Design a binder for this molecule. Structure first.
Ligand SMILES: CCONC(=O)N1CCC[C@H](C(=O)N[C@@H](C)c2nc(-c3ccc(C#N)cc3)cs2)C1
Lengths: 228, 225, 226, 228, 211, 225, 212, 230, 213
């Protein structure tokens, strides 16, 4: 009775539809993101329903130094990806400088929570992991209930608790480690979530004097060999 | 079955959605504002996210400012609070559009309280889940502190606490009169009441040392307190 | 509520619309280096129906075709939208749309009912859209949930599972275009054969042009079954 | 505005060793009548950005109030010193405003100069921005002076003159200007340019306001009378 | 400009020049004026080049969408009607378009003339542009229905040559296309009118030609 | 189903009764009394239901210099009705160029309230109002309305009725009317009242402007009784 | 009344070989017998194998180039590949025709090297009419340069031919063309920028000209 | 319900309002369409109280060359027919050629799907049988369901007891046939469900020139022949 | 969100109209009597409330007056609308509005809320009295939106008994004074309770005038 519509607060003081949208995030595949003094690396699992199916794209570009990973409903993620891309390019057209990530994440969070007020609309059933280098590496989590948070390290999706435990164990080493060491730590966390075939793992990097770039297949194979 | 809509009075004459919003806000993080002789000291305790160790240290700040001399803090949901804060900023900007002067604090309080109240009328809008402390300090007028409840009310205080554990914090801060105490001598007592660690707290004030303008405590003043 | 969520995080209307796409005649699509082929079963309920009037296969563009299952009228609306948008792209840019981009447009219209940013309910159709672009041939599956999936080979309709198993058991990457043709006919034969029983279309890498099969082409691959 | 009535005269601006120096006389003419002779014509946008105008006063005041509220909007969304908008951002905003107004055949009857310091590395002024209450040698590439026109055409140079100074002072600047000029050399050069403008321009005045945008912020020198 | 279409025994001939002069200055003598609207209908540019190019391509996209929806090639009459209605919708805006749409459909060989002012006229011998009167003179003098393909081709080439010779705003090259049942052919893709003058009127080339 | 503002099978509208119950639940009392050439409203200065600023609490309001009012009920609804009354008076002055009457303002406010009464999609304002002002014939006017959207003029009113009935020079008339209002509130509440917890507001022919007497004058009047 | 159009002057020359494109343009900006500045570039980069130069009103040119760059970047983000010069050409035509009843006062040359490693130049008027060419010129000086290019490139009035064209000779020819433009055109002068695209990318050279 | 979803997916996967519209269509009177070489015949049942109701309309001439026969709700049929006539004339204005039967059948099916999909509207409780001529001068018949799906038919029946008349038409259609034989086939087909009488049916022959209604005397003679046969 | 709250019952009844009818039935009574040379409408009804500010009988125009039974606020908005429509007809055609046209317009407006989405019917019944070139007019408008043309009628509480009394007492050829006396007789089944309005222009009779009658 208290979860039939999204505008009704529960007697405890909870919005059940928004919490169901936040529960839809857990069904997505695992994604992990970590950073250091310089770089950010984001890794994820490309869903493959059958051997005839190609893997599903997991990471997307937003700007020259911004990229995203998603967990939840893919259409919502596509809508928000288009919104962020148009916002970044509109800032680049109106003014001749890069958009602030803080303003962009605030805009995306406002766009989320605008749908949680009108009874006609529904909350966004997708959680976002925005990785960027504006003046320094940065990772942002955005949840369906309108909130966003900075993160030193981050992970979420199906079976993400083990990777989060690995990050809780190894957070103190990421700041001083080199870029290849950081890539190995991210890949080890992604393995701990679970087999890391060339097809089923997406990985990308962004940092100082390094635009957003998916690591190639040969380099990815070399790094996956180095994981042991 | 009268509590399933904000636009219906129960047989007792009560709107239960407002009471449920009150319960939700009381379940959220604690926020204090206090009126000292040289300034007002405001702070927030983000202890609900103590379990989350992955958060970047001192990044989730519930303290915001308007026109560089009006602190505005909240207890409730983040998105609704950001709507209220952006509306307050827009109203201040409109007042400067028309009149070339900063908006008075109480007119902003009335306008934003009416804006919050406007959502508690229709059957197709979610009422705001946030209690808002808006405050300022002046050399002449001393500290004006206003608390806007989710029901559209707005009340002036000489000290206010909202969020979880508000009763204990209220009776603790009520013990001593702060109209003859400075902010530097008050931060120690605020930390003592927060104990009854330091990366889950936010602070701000508008005293003379900040030239009566918004600021946050530097780590070198945080630590010795 | 059309937009209401479930406690499991799944939208009720999308979950219900997924039940509609199972119902329908079976169709299959195979992609090889030489080209892409889509075969489809016809439902000739009685002799009074004109056979050529009902067409399960059709063109979204000169270089794109599709096999559709589910609620047919919704499919006619979707293909009309796709045709308009594809020709708009060809006007605005003077080239051919990628099949991924057309599939993404069709998926973007699919969940227009949600009104996140006008349709009122989800579509009840699933589409195997094949075609040749600068990246070669490809074949993309889309469903009411709004998710797209590039496939080497795929099937839709009532006998989805059996056709999928037969495709998985008897598909190779480097197989000849005629090899893929006999694969399509064998899969449809096992699911259910003569001219006008099945409709076949092909888009080749050499031509990049839609080509609906007819008499003496349907029978040619029927004559070389194992 | 349908055309100018109360018009402001030329503005001069140059780079020098410690920052920007911008000069304007404090006269606004009502046709051919010195109705006002104490008019502030150079506006402080923020601690490292100032604006000057030549044209109708009402349009300039409108643009100044627009940029002022843009500055408070920027300050409200501030977390660190690098979040502040540089003179490049304000110059692009003014250019877009003038272009959009030009599309409708309804311009702001003005020619605008936007000047200041781009980089934040020379001081920590914007750590605690205050609104209601030795120098450093700054590189030429970290300074900014930019012209914006009624038709929206805009550009940047080491020295910008707007108004009638484009003929009288621009010649002397193109002859005598040099890089790394001292404050005194810049002052005497600007004084000579304003002397020639006062002698040869009817609408000009010999009551000058100089503003310095340096490492210690914006500094309004007390107005003075040009000797002879 | 000079564009000149005309029906004849085996089909339709279309012929155009290739200039895009901006007032007195010649901007380019290599412009394609016979826009292929689709595989059977052919366009033709006169007047404003931007409007003709844009709206003929728009008619092309409209015809492609119609043919894909209904699965049958459109008629010359329907394309002419759509173009005329679209152009009449922009009455009072300053468009400048003179178009000759020729083609083959199930009704037969059909030719139409359309204008930016909503005109639509069905005929068998049309000409547009600044040099249209001269091409009309040559065509109406020499036109016959029972001409062969080569006879009609040389007639069209001669008419275009005379139009370019008299008219200051026409010249460059001449492009002559032939439309038949199964499509169309570019009989002359491009040919300088310099050689046309020194072949037709001044073959001796011993002195300057007196007009 | 009593949720909507629709007719019950007995013909009653229960949402208006529930809103009136909401107004009564605040336990806030205000007494309006007319005089020969003056009108008084005396209201009780307390929150609707230690560090709270008790000077800021008030039920009386200034719609205009001449007209004033006292609203009782929900606080957000009270402020919203105050802003509606000010907008109505301002619109009247703009269109007609002379000051609206208390009577006409009450008519228009209840016309606005009837829209919420009739429309199902609008919640009713839990607000009763008591407006006073002098008319153009130099006589007082005391009008009063409730959440039902029905207004009436009263010789005296409360938001007990018999207590006023038995009780019922310009300076002497003003003094007697103020004493009557204070004594009526004291007798209705049935406990001795301090001057710091009540608020008196007066309009009169001598001073046309709405104004509230200071606490010293209220103390003098209480010591007089 | 206020007339919402000015001519900022200057010139932009474009040439193509079998496997390369050269685009020269002056960097003078002028209101009317006056000089705003002595360095205002007219050529912009769109992709790693395409450039656009233009002459006319400078605000229109700058806004058009920024909008076209934004549209190409959105195209790359959406369609997962970089557009050819022909795709950008049709896009520019549509963008210019969108303002058909209040046009961009800008005449453009779109230079690039296509999929087939073939140099392509598309010249554009204000209202979107456009065509391919081997050589083109826009701006104040164009009526001077274009007869020279017609004489040298496609010699028609010459009975014996010499078509031994190479990159260095073409660069020298374009340098001579812009030099002759500077001599006989008041609005052409100051430095000039020459962009070259042959097989790998863009290479930029600069040349001082007469400062008068 | 100004903009609200009246038709939505059920737990099984059906759009329940569409089947309810089909149930409404099953109440409508029987209507039969038969094709021939260059002409068609449409025969539709009529029910009217004798001696009171004016006999004077289930068949319609849509434009110069099309014709329609519906089964279901009559007011919905009337508004759909008015929209169809408007679109016929709109096409003939926008193309300067008469609307083909295939185009207008597609438009009617599109409109029915649109009312099956838009918010704040109810599905059309009517099935339709259109008959007409194409651009290539061939004649054909299109049957359109309430669910937005259409299809071309050689011969078809809609309305109450449609299955019996359909399976009767299956065993008697013989490709090209004369006008007399076509009309007689239509009469004996539609009379397998409705009572054997002359006044319970109206039948019309569509030719390239115009749609001609068969006079009551011919129908009565053919009814007498049918009665003598059985 | 525009959906009709008033809906047909399974027995073909608009029960919301029935409940509004019940509400006006529970309200205090009013009545009207039409004479050969006049028309009268009268009412029935604290010691602190002012009698001047609560007049149920109101004037729409110079020869049209109105009385109601039901809700006060609904009556005030309908009175404002009636005055606006009368002013609209006077501004358009010049002459003062006819009683029948005003009654038809108000009846249409009252019926509109019976069908418009998201609103309820008016909770009152009106009685218009007036004079024009076609004589004297008395018209009753229900919550349903139906206008009834009467010689004399009663509305509100105990209206059946009052109708029986008036039907026994009423005659067609009565005078203004006899009609006023019969109205007071019907209302009897004090001075301050009754208020009377008679339509020469429409007027409200002061308290002494009812006192002498
Ligand atoms: C402020 C602008 O400075 N003034 C300028 O730039 N001018 C004026 C003088 C002649 C110049 C000229 O003609 N330049 C040649 C290379 C051009 N040709 C075209 C063109 C476009 C489309 C078609 C077609 N179909 C044909 C030609 C566009 S430019 C263009």
């Amino acid at each position: 009775l208290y979860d039939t519509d999204n505008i009704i607060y529960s007697p405890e003081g909870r919005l059940y539809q928004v919490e169901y949208a936040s529960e839809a995030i857990k069904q997505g595949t695992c994604a992990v993101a970590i950073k250091s003094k310089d770089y950010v690396v984001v890794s994820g699992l490309k869903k493959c329903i059958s051997k005839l199916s190609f893997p599903q794209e997991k990471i997307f570009k937003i700007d020259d130094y911004i990229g995203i990973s998603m967990s939840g409903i893919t259409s919502d993620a596509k809508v928000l990806t288009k919104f962020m891309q148009n916002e970044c390019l509109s800032h680049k057209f109106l003014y001749n400088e890069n958009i602030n990530i803080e303003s962009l994440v605030r805009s995306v969070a406002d766009k989320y929570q605008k749908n949680t007020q009108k009874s006609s609309k529904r909350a966004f059933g997708v959680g976002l992991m925005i990785a960027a280098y504006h003046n320094e590496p940065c990772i942002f989590e955005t949840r369906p209930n309108g909130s966003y948070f900075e993160y030193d390290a981050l992970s979420f999706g199906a079976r993400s608790h083990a990777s989060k435990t690995y990050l809780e164990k190894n957070l103190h080493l990421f700041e001083e480690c080199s870029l290849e060491e950081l890539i190995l730590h991210c890949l080890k966390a992604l393995k701990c979530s679970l087999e890391l075939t060339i097809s089923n793992t997406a990985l990308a990097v962004v940092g100082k004097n390094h635009p957003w770039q998916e690591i190639s297949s040969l380099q990815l194979e070399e790094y996956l060999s180095k994981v042991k | 079955g009268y509590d399933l809509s904000v636009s219906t009075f129960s047989p007792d004459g009560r709107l239960y959605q407002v009471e449920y919003i009150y319960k939700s806000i009381n379940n959220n993080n604690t926020a204090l504002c206090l009126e000292c002789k040289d300034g007002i000291i405001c702070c927030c305790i983000n202890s609900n996210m103590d379990k989350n160790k992955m958060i970047k240290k001192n990044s989730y700040n519930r303290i915001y400012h308007v026109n560089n001399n009006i602190i505005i803090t909240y207890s409730g949901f983040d998105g609704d609070a950001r709507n209220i804060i952006d509306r307050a900023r827009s109203e201040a900007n409109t007042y400067y559009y028309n009149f070339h002067t900063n908006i008075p604090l109480h007119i902003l309080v009335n306008r934003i309280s009416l804006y919050i109240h406007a959502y508690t009328l229709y059957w197709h809008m979610r009422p705001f889940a946030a209690s808002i402390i808006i405050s300022s300090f002046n050399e002449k007028d001393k500290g004006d502190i206003y608390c806007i409840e989710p029901n559209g009310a707005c009340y002036k205080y000489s000290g206010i606490v909202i969020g979880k554990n508000k009763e204990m914090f209220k009776t603790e801060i009520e013990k001593k009169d702060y109209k003859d105490i400075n902010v530097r001598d008050a931060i120690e007592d605020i930390y003592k009441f927060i104990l009854t660690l330091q990366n889950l707290v936010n602070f701000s004030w508008i005293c003379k040392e900040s030239s009566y303008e918004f600021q946050n405590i530097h780590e070198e003043i945080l630590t010795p307190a | 509520g059309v937009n209401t969520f479930s406690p499991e995080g799944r939208l009720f209307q999308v979950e219900y619309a997924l039940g509609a796409i199972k119902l329908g005649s079976t169709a299959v699509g195979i992609c090889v280096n030489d080209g892409v082929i889509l075969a489809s079963e016809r439902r000739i309920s009685s002799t009074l129906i004109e056979k050529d009037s009902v067409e399960k296969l059709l063109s979204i563009d000169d270089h794109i075709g599709c096999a559709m299952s589910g609620l047919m009228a919704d499919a006619r609306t979707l293909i009309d939208y796709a045709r308009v948008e594809c020709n708009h792209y060809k006007f605005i840019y003077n080239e051919n749309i990628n099949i991924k981009s057309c599939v993404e447009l069709i998926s973007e219209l699919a969940l227009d009912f949600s009104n996140l940013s006008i349709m009122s309910r989800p579509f009840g159709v699933a589409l195997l859209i094949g075609g040749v672009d600068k990246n070669g041939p490809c074949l993309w599956y889309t469903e009411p949930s709004g998710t797209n999936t590039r496939f080497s080979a795929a099937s839709i309709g009532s006998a989805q599972e059996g056709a999928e198993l037969l495709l998985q058991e008897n598909y190779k990457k480097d197989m000849t275009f005629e090899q893929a043709e006999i694969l399509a006919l064998t899969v449809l034969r096992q699911v259910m054969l003569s001219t006008s029983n099945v409709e076949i279309c092909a888009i080749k890498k050499s031509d990049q042009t839609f080509y609906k099969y007819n008499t003496d082409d349907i029978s040619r691959i029927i004559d070389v079954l194992p | 505005t349908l055309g100018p009535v109360v018009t402001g005269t030329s503005v001069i601006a140059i780079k020098y060793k410690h920052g920007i120096m911008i000069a304007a006389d404090r006269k606004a003419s009502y046709g051919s009548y010195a109705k006002f002779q104490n008019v502030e014509r150079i506006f402080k946008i923020n601690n490292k950005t100032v604006m000057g105008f030549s044209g109708e006063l009402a349009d300039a005041q409108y643009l100044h109030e627009l940029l002022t509220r843009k500055n408070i909007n920027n300050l409200s969304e501030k977390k660190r010193k690098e979040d502040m908008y540089t003179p490049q951002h304000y110059h692009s905003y003014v250019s877009r405003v003038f272009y959009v107004r030009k599309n409708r055949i309804d311009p702001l009857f003005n020619n605008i100069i936007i000047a200041g310091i781009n980089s934040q590395k020379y001081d920590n002024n914007d750590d605690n921005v205050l609104l209601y209450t030795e120098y450093k040698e700054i590189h030429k590439d970290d300074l900014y002076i930019g012209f914006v026109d009624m038709h929206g055409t805009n550009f940047c140079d080491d020295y910008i003159t707007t108004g009638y100074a484009r003929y009288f002072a621009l010649t002397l600047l193109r002859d005598h200007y040099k890089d790394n000029m001292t404050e005194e050399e810049a002052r005497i050069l600007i004084n000579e340019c304003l002397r020639i403008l006062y002698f040869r321009d009817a609408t000009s005045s010999n009551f000058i306001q100089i503003v310095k945008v340096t490492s210690k912020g914006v500094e309004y020198e007390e107005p003075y009378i040009l000797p002879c | 400009t000079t564009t000149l279409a005309f029906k004849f025994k085996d089909g339709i001939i279309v012929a155009v020049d290739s200039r895009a002069s901006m007032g007195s200055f010649i901007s380019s003598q290599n412009v394609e004026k016979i826009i292929e609207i689709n595989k059977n209908i052919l366009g033709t540019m006169a007047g404003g080049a931007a409007d003709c190019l844009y709206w003929e391509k728009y008619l092309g996209k409209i015809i492609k969408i119609y043919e894909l929806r209904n699965n049958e090639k459109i008629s010359v009459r329907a394309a002419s009607t759509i173009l005329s209605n679209i152009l009449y919708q922009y009455k009072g805006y300053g468009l400048c378009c003179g178009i000759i749409l020729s083609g083959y459909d199930h009704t037969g060989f059909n030719m139409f003339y359309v204008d930016d002012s909503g005109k639509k006229v069905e005929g068998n011998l049309f000409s547009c542009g600044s040099g249209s009167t001269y091409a009309y003179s040559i065509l109406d003098s020499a036109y016959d229905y029972n001409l062969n393909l080569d006879q009609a081709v040389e007639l069209a080439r001669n008419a275009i040559y005379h139009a370019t010779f008299r008219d200051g705003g026409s010249g460059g090259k001449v492009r002559v296309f032939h439309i038949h049942k199964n499509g169309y052919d570019k009989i002359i893709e491009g040919e300088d009118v310099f050689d046309l003058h020194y072949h037709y009127t001044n073959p001796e080339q011993k002195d300057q030609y007196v007009m | 189903d009593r949720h909507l503002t629709i007719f019950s099978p007995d013909g009653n509208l229960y949402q208006i009764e529930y809103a009136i119950k909401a107004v009564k639940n605040t336990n806030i009392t205000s007494v309006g009394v007319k005089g020969e050439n003056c009108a008084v409203i005396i209201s009780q200065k307390k929150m609707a239901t230690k560090l709270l600023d008790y000077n800021n609490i008030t039920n009386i309001y200034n719609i205009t210099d001449e007209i004033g009012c006292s609203m009782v009920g929900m606080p957000g609804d009270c402020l919203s009705m105050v802003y509606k009354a000010r907008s109505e008076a301002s619109e009247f002055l703009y269109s007609n160029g002379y000051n609206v009457n208390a009577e006409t303002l009450c008519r228009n406010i209840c016309d606005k309230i009837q829209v919420y009464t009739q429309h199902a999609y609008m919640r009713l304002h839990a607000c009763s109002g008591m407006i006073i002002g002098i008319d153009e014939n130099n006589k007082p006017e005391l009008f009063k309305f409730d959440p039902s959207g029905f207004c009436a003029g009263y010789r005296a009113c409360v938001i007990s009725i018999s207590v006023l009935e038995r009780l019922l020079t310009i300076d002497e008339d003003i003094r007697n009317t103020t004493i009557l209002a204070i004594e009526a509130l004291q007798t209705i509440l049935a406990f001795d009242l301090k001057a710091s917890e009540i608020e008196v507001a007066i309009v009169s022919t001598k001073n046309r402007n709405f104004t509230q007497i200071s606490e010293k004058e209220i103390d003098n009047y209480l010591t007089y009784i | 009344r206020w007339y919402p159009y000015i001519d900022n002057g200057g010139t932009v020359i474009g040439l193509t070989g079998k496997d390369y494109v050269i685009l020269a343009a002056d960097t003078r900006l002028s209101l009317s017998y006056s000089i705003y500045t002595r360095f205002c570039p007219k050529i912009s980069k769109l992709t790693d194998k395409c450039i656009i130069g233009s002459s006319g009103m400078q605000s229109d040119i700058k806004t058009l180039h920024s909008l076209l760059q934004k549209k190409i970047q959105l195209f790359v983000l959406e369609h997962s590949h970089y557009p050819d010069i022909h795709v950008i050409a049709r896009l520019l035509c549509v963008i210019l025709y969108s303002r058909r009843f209040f046009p961009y006062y800008a005449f453009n040359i779109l230079a690039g090297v296509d999929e087939n490693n073939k140099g392509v130049l598309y010249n554009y008027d204000s209202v979107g009419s456009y065509c391919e060419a081997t050589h083109s010129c826009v701006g104040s000086g164009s009526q001077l340069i274009l007869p020279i290019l017609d004489n040298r490139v496609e010699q028609k009035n010459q009975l014996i031919k010499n078509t031994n064209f190479n990159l260095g000779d073409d660069i020298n020819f374009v340098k001579d063309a812009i030099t002759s433009a500077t001599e006989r055109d008041i609005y052409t002068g100051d430095k000039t920028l020459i962009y070259v695209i042959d097989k790998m990318g863009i290479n930029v050279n600069t040349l001082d000209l007469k400062q008068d | 319900s100004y903009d609200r979803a009246i038709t939505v997916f059920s737990p099984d996967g059906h759009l329940l309002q569409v089947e309810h519209a089909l149930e409404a269509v099953k109440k409508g009177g029987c209507a039969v369409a038969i094709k021939s070489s260059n002409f068609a015949v449409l025969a539709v049942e009529k029910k009217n109280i004798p001696k009171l109701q004016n006999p004077k309309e289930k068949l319609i001439k849509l434009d110069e060359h099309n014709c329609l026969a519906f089964a279901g709700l009559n007011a919905d049929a009337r508004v759909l027919v008015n929209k169809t006539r408007l679109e016929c004339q709109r096409y003939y204005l926008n193309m300067d050629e008469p609307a083909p039967v295939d185009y207008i059948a597609k438009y009617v099916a599109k409109v029915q799907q649109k009312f099956t999909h838009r918010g704040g509207v109810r599905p059309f409780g009517i099935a339709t049988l259109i008959a007409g001529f194409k651009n290539n001068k061939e004649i054909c018949i299109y049957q359109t369901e309430p669910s937005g799906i259409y299809a071309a038919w050689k011969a078809q029946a809609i309305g109450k007891n449609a299955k019996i008349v359909q399976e009767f038409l299956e065993k008697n259609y013989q490709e090209n046939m004369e006008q007399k034989d076509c009309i007689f086939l239509a009469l004996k087909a539609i009379f397998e469900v409705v009572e054997l009488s002359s006044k319970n049916v109206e039948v019309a022959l569509l030719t390239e020139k115009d749609l001609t209604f068969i006079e009551e005397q011919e129908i009565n003679s053919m009814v007498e022949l049918i009665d003598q046969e059985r | 969100y525009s959906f009709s709250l008033t809906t047909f019952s399974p027995t073909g009844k608009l029960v919301q109209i029935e409940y509004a009818l019940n509400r006006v039935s529970s309200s205090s009574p009013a009545l009207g009597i039409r004479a050969k040379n006049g028309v009268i409408i009268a009412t029935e009804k604290n010691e602190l409330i002012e009698e001047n500010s609560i007049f149920k009988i109101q004037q729409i125009s110079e020869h049209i007056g109105i009385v109601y039974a039901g809700m006060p606020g609904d009556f005030r908005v309908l009175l404002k609308r009636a005055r606006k429509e009368a002013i609209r007809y006077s501004l358009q055609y010049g002459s003062e509005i006819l009683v029948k046209e005003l009654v038809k317009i108000i009846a249409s407006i009252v019926q509109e809320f019976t069908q418009t989405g998201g609103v309820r019917p008016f909770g009152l019944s009106l009685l218009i009295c007036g004079v024009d070139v076609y004589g004297y007019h008395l018209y009753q408008i229900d919550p349903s939106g139906c206008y009834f043309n009467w010689m004399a009628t009663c509305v509100g509480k105990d209206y059946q008994n009052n109708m029986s009394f008036l039907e026994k007492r009423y005659n067609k050829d009565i005078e203004i004074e006899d009609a006023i006396h019969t109205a007071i007789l019907t209302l009897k089944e004090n001075e301050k309770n009754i208020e009377i309005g008679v339509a020469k222009p429409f007027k409200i009779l002061t308290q002494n005038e009812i006192k002498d009658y």
